[PDB]
Amino acid sequence: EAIAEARELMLVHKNIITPRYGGPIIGGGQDYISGAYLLSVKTTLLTVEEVATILGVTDFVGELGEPAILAPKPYYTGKQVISLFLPKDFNFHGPANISKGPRACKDEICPHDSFIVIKNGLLLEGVFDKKAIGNQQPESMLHWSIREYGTEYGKWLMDNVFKMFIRFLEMRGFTM
């Protein structure tokens, strides 16, 4: 009886949202945010081998689709690799944590990647930072994603997509 109650009421993934306020207490940390920003930035292009190396840490297997850029050289992109995990009916429009300084464009027409635009599960512009995957950040895209696809999709996402951030961070160089 004690084991059944512990499994049915006290599991970690069932308590992603804290009772103090409506917002996730389990979320991205410090290396995760930097990796997400570096992978999501506009200037990231990956080859087939790099994409395979990045996706080897997750459970994803299937069709990658056509590369984002076909000629002169076949290049993928960070947003295309990220978009393989978002549900196919998820929409989100909101600013990023880097939209505070001179990058504030306050609308979708932004020369920077300072505005997040997701339509039908496709990440079209914007970067991931503390305001999208960070912990203790209510009304973020992670919060809405969990709220609409259960702690089940919350746990699946946190287990899968959060490892590509670390893998890409160590694939690139991050020093001080």
Binding site: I17, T18, R20, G22, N91, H93, N120, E139
Partner: protein, 58 residues
């Protein structure tokens, strides 16, 4: 504070009552919404619902 608020419970009619019988609140909070299930201290975000429905054409 724990020793003060230890014996409060939510009944099947929505009221908040102590285990000794007396009534603390006629309905929990003001609309019987758990803070854990709320959208950041809010029953439902209507703007978020409108976005979820028609954001692919904005």
């Amino acid at each position: 504070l724990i020793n003060a608020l230890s014996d409060l419970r939510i009944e099947y009619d929505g009221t908040v009552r102590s285990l000794y019988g007396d009534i603390v609140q006629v309905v929990y909070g003001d609309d019987a919404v758990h803070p854990m299930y709320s959208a950041h201290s809010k029953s439902v975000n209507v703007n978020r619902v409108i976005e979820r429905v028609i954001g692919w054409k904005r």
